[PDB]
Design a protein around this ligand. Sequence first.
Ligand SMILES: O=C(O)[C@H]1O[C@@H](O[C@H]2[C@H](O)[C@H](O)[C@H](O[C@H]3[C@H](O)[C@H](O)[C@H](O[C@H]4[C@H](O)[C@H](O)[C@H](O)O[C@@H]4C(=O)O)O[C@@H]3C(=O)O)O[C@@H]2C(=O)O)[C@@H](O)[C@@H](O)[C@@H]1O
Ligand SMILES: [Ca+2]
Ligand SMILES: [Ca+2]
Lengths: 726, 726
Amino acid sequence: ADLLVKTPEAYDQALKKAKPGDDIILANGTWRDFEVLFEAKGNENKPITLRGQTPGKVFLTGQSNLRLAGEHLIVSGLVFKDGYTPTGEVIAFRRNKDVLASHSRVTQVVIDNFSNPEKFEQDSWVMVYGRHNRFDHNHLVGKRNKGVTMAVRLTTESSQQNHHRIDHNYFGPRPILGSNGGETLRIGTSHHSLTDSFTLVENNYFDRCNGEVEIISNKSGKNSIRNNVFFESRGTLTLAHGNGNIVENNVFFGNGVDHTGGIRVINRDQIIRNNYLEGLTGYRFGSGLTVMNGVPNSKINRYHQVDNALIENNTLVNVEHIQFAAGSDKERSAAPINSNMNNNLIVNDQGTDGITAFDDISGIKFKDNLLNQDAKPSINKGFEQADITMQRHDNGLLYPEAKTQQKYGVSTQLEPIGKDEVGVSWYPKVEPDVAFGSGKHIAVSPGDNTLFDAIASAETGDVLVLQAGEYWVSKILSLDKTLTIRAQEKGSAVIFPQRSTLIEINNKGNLTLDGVYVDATNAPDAAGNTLIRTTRLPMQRNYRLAIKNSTFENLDINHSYHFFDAGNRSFADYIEVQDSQFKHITGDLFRLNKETDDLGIYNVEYLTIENSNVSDLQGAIAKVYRGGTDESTFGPHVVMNNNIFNEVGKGKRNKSAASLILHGTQVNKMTTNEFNNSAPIIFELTVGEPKTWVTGNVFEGTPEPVVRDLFPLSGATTTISGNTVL
Amino acid sequence: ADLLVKTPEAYDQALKKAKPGDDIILANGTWRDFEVLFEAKGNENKPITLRGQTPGKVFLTGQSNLRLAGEHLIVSGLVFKDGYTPTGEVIAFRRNKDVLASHSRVTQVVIDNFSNPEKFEQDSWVMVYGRHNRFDHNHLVGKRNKGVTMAVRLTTESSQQNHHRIDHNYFGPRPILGSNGGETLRIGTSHHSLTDSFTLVENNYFDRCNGEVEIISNKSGKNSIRNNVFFESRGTLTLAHGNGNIVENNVFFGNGVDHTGGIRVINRDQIIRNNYLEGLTGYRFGSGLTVMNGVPNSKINRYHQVDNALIENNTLVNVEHIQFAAGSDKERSAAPINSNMNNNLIVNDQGTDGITAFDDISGIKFKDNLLNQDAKPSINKGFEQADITMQRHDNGLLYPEAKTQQKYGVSTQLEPIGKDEVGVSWYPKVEPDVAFGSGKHIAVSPGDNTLFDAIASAETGDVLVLQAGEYWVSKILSLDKTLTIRAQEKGSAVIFPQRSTLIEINNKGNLTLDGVYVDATNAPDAAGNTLIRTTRLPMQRNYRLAIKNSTFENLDINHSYHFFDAGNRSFADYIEVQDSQFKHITGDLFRLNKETDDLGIYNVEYLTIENSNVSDLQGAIAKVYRGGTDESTFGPHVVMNNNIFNEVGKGKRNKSAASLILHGTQVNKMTTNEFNNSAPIIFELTVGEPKTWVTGNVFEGTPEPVVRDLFPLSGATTTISGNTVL
Ligand SMILES: O=C(O)[C@H]1O[C@@H](O[C@H]2[C@H](O)[C@H](O)[C@H](O[C@H]3[C@H](O)[C@H](O)[C@H](O[C@H]4[C@H](O)[C@H](O)[C@H](O)O[C@@H]4C(=O)O)O[C@@H]3C(=O)O)O[C@@H]2C(=O)O)[C@@H](O)[C@@H](O)[C@@H]1O
Ligand SMILES: [Ca+2]
Ligand SMILES: [Ca+2]
C-alpha cells in the first residue's frame, strides 16, 4: 500500500502501521528540521520503503538527518540541502548502538553541500553499520567540514563481516580541507583493522575528491575495491590497515592535475591487478604507485610490512613517481617480502621510468614488465624495453598497438564507468566553482559609495569595470560572491579606503583585482588596519584571491596597517599576485599564520607572487604557518619569482625578523628575485620531507636564507644555490 | 503643536516644518535601523521636542543612533535595544565636528544591551559636546564592549566651559570588560585636561559598574561630582588629569564586595569633602582612598603631583586601604604637597586603620581626625583614638553615637539618592544575571539524545536531574541559558560523548555540573577534541562555569583532547571546580591563554580548583595568560587548594613544560596541594605588583615552583614558604 504523508506526525502514524511491501511516501515539498528515524521490519521479498513522492521535489533541509533501523528497508528519492545534520552523520544505518539496520538499501539520495557551518566540528555524511546493506546510485558533493564523507563502521561483530555493497555512486567534488580528515571513503578503523569486513566498493565515480591525501582509506580486511573511476582527484587509494584486500579494474585519470595519486600498498596479501593509471603527478606517499615500508612489530595503528603483495597487469601512463619501499627509516625498517610484480606496463614520456627505491627491494620478484625504449630503467631483472606506440581505444584507455605487447598492462575489456552512468539522472552534476568573468560586465562610475553599490547588485561571476576617477569607500565592502574589479584604463582608477577595512571576503566570496590603484592615505589613523581580510567569523567555503596589474600605496598612517589578514580557520584555495606594486606599508603583506594550535591546519594552499614590486614594507612579505606533525595534507606551496623587494621586513614590530617566514610549508620555490636591503628569508621545516628551491636571486644588503630544520635529518630536500650575496 | 510621524520620511517632513514649542512624536512600535538626526532651533522657553508616543513602547533597534544639533532641543521617552550604533556613538550632542548642540536635553531614554557584538570594536553610548546641555533621568545598562559608556568631549573651545549637567541617571550594571577601556563616565581627555569644563555630575546611581578600575575618569578642570551613590561597583572615582575639581556628598556602598574602590586623588586643588565610604575592599590604585604620587617634569598624559588637596569630613567605615603617596617609584617621585586632611572619621573593625604611606607624607597636614579604639594607628599626629559606637541613621549611614564625635566625618544631613529615584519608572531595573537553581527542576531519563532535549525545553535557571543510567549524546549540547545538570545520585549518571564537543557554552549560557560522570572513550578519534568550550564565534555575554562532585575520565582517544577550551575574546566571570576527579586526558585541562597580542586582555576573572583530583593529564591544569603592561584590570585570580595532582603536565606537546603556567595573573594562591610526579608550577609575573602565595604544598617528584619576573623589582609580593620538596 501507498501511505502518503505530508507532516512529520503523519509520517509517525504511517510508520506505526506499515507492513512488508508498503511504501511510505513523503509528499513533495521542503521538510525542514526533519530527523527521520525509519525503524521497521520488512520481509525478504516485501521490503518497507520510504521514498519521496517525486525524486527531486522532496527536500530535507535544516537540521535534518536519516537513520535506518530494522531489516529489509529501502530509502529512495530524497535531497538533503540547505542545512546540516545535528548528529554525527547525515545518513546512518542504525538507530543507535542497540538497534542496527541490516539488509537495507539507500538509493537515489542526494546530499548537496549539507555542510556543517563550523569547518572543524566533525561529522560524516554516510555511516554504515550492521550487515548486507547497500548504498547505491547516490549523489554526494560539496562536503567542506572535517570528517570523512562515507564510512563503513566495524565497532561490533554485528557490523563486521558485512558484505555491504557500495556501487554506482557519484562521489562528487570535495574541496581541500586544509587539514586531515578529508577522506571520501573509509572502510573500518585502525582498532578493528584486523577484522574482516568484506565490503564491495564497485563502479563508483570519484570526481575531484580533493579533501586530503587519502581518497579511500581502507582499514580492515578482505574488502574488494573494484571498477571505480578516480577523475582528477588529489590523493590515493590507500590500503592503510588490514590484509587480504583486492584492488582491481580501477581507472585513474589524473590529467596531470597537481598531486593526483595513486594506489598505496601497505600490509599483507593485497592484490592489485588490472588497474589503469594515467597522468598522476603525485609524489612521496601520494605517488601513482607506492609500496610502503612497515613497522615491525606493532600495533594496529601503525603500518605493517608489505608481505605477499601481488601487483599484476596494471598500466601506468605518464605516472611521475612509482615508489618501492617508500617511507623507509628507523621505525619503518620492514622492507617488502614475498611479493610479486608481474606483467605491468609502464610508459613515460620524459626519459625516466618514474621508479625510485628506498630500501632493499629483493623481497619483490619482478617478472615480465614492459616499458618503452626511451624510458630508462631503474631495475634490471623483470623489466625489458621495447618499441611501443600507445593508441587510445574506444574505452578511453591507452594500449600498445603491437598485439604482442598486449600481454602487458590492463585487459582491453576494461570499461571505465562514465560520470553520466552514476548518481541520479534527476539531479545535475555541476561545477563547484564560479569562474571569474563568467557573467556580465558592469560599468561603474566614480563617486561616493559607487563601488559599494555596484558590488551589492552584481551577480556572481560578473566583472565591474571602473571608469576613470576617484572611488571613496566609507562602507566596508563585503564580498559574498565571485567578482572581478577591473579598471577600464590601468592606473586611471584610484580607490581611497576610509575605514579600517576596505574589502572583507565572506562565505562564497572570491575576488580578482585587475588594474586598480589603492591610495590608503585616508584610512583611519589607527593601528591594526587591514586593507583586505576575510570575515572574522569562521568561514565555510575556501576562497580565491588574484591580484594583477594593481598598485597599493600608503598603508602607513599608523602602525600595523596590514595588506591581507586571514581569519582563523580560513582557507584560500589560492592567493596569487602578478605584475603588481606595493609601496609604504607598515604591517605585514600576507598574514597566513593564524593556526597556532599545531594540528596540521593551514590557511592557504598556493601562495604565488610573480613579476611584482614591493618597496618600503616594515613587516613580512608572508608569514605562513602549518604546525604539528600531520602528513595528511599537500600544502602550503609558496612560489615567488621575478620580484623586486626593497626595504622589506626590517620593522621593529615584526617579531619574525624576516621578510618571509615559512613554518611547515611543503613546497617552496624562490627563483630570480631581488632582496635588496631587507630582512632574510627564514624557513622552519617540519615533517613530511618538504622540498625547497632558492636559486638565482640577488641578496644585496639582505642576509643569507636561514634554514631551521625542526625535524632533522628527516628528508627535507633543500637546494639553496645559484644566488649572489652582496 | 504635536506632529505624530509613523515613518522616517514623515519624520523628515515634520522636522522641516516644526517650530519652537512643537513636539515631533514618534509613533509606538519598533523603528529598525533608524539613524536619527534631530537638528532644529527652539527657544529658551519654547523648545522643540522629539519624543516617543508612549515611553516604553517606542524602540530603536538594529543600526540606530541619535544626533542632536542646534539649541533648545529635548529628546525623551526612547528605548534603544536589539542592535548597536553604526557610528562612534549611540547618542551624540552634535551633527558633526562643526555643528554642535547646546542648551539641549536628553531625558527618560533607555539604552539596554545595545552593545556592538565584537567586544573590541570600540564605541561609546553617550557623547556630549557644546555647552549647557543636560542628560538626566536616563537608564544605561549592559554595555559589553570596549569604550566608555558616556563621555564629555572638549575637542574644541566650543565644547569647553560647558556647565553640562548630568543628573538622576541609572548607570546600571556594566560587566567586567577584561581589558582597559570599560569606564562608565569620562569627563575630558588628557590632552584637553587643562581646560575648564565645569561639568556637574550629581544624583546618579552607579549600580555594579564593573567595567574596569575607573568607574569615573575625570580629565578636565573644575568639574563637580557630588551626591552620587556607587553601589557594589568594582572601580574608583579617579581624578586622573585636571585640577580644581570637587568631589563631595558621595556615598560608596561596597558591601565588602571584591575590588570596591575608591576616590583616587591626583593633581591640584582637589576638594574631597563629606563623602561616605563603607565596606570597600579595593587596594593599590583601586583603594577606598588613594593619594597618588605624581610625575614631576611633567607632561600631560602624566599623573601630576598632588598639590593643595583638601580631604575633609569624609567617613570611612571598613575601608580596607587608605594609601598615601601611592605609586611612588623612580618616575613617580613627587610626593603630595601643601595638602590637608581634616575632620575625617575612620572606623575599621579589622585591627588596623588601613593606612599605608609609600613615600614622604609631610606635605599632607593632618588635623582633628578620629579613629576607633581597636584600630592600630599608622599615623599619630592629627589622629586621635576614642571609643566609638556607630548607629545607622535613617538615611542608611553610620554615625557616632556621641555628639562630641559628630564633628568628624560626614554631616547628618546627607540623603543618599536611592536606586528607585533614578532612571525612569516605566522601565524595570532587573538583575544582570540569572542565578543557578532559580528555576524549576526537570527530571531526565536515559538515553536517546535525552539530555539534548531536556536542555532545549528547559527555562533559564532550571535544574535538570539525571536519573541513573547511561546518557549517549550524539548532538552538541549548546547552552544559551543558565542551567544546572545534576545527577539524582552522585556517580549514577554516566554521559558518553560521541562528538568532538560535548558542551558548548553560548551567549547567555552558564553551566553548573553537579555529580555527573563523563566517560569520553567513544569520542571521535581525532586530535583537538574539547569536552567543554565556549562558542567559537564572537561571544557577547561573559559566562560562569561551576563543576562539582563530578568525574571526567578517558579523554585520551587521540592527542590534544582538552577538557575546557576558551574561545578568543571570551571571558569567564568565574570558573569553579569543586570536589571533582579527572583521569587520563591528553590535552590541557583549562585553556585560558588565548589573548596573545599583549594588550591587557584576558579570559577569566576567577579560576578556582579545590578538593579535586587530577591524574594522568599530559597538558597543563591551566594555562592562563594576560600579556602587556596594562594596569586597568584586577585579574585573573587563580586559587587552587587541597588538590592531588598526579602525573600532570609532562606530555610531549605541552610547550609550556608546566603543570600550571600563569602569566600576568594578579592574585595567586596554591595552598595545601600535592604535586606528585608532574611538571612544575611556572609563574610569569608582569606588572601591577601581583600577589602570590604558594604555601603548604608537597612537591614530591615535581620540580619546585619556577618564578620569572618580567619586571623586577616592582611591588610583586611573593611568599613561597612551608612546602615540602621531595
Ligand atoms: O602618567 C602616568 O603615570 C600614568 O598615566 C595613565 O594613563 C592614563 C592616561 O591619562 C590616558 O588618559 C589614557 O586614557 C586614554 C585612553 O586609554 C585612550 O587612549 C583614549 O583614546 C582617545 C584618544 O586619546 C583620542 O582623544 C580619541 O579622539 O579618542 C580616544 C578614545 O575615546 O579612546 O584616550 C584616553 C585619554 O587620553 O585619557 O590611559 C590612562 C587612563 O587613565 O585611562 C595610567 O594609565 C598609567 O599607566 C600611567 O603610568
Ligand atoms: Ca587523516
Ligand atoms: Ca582606563
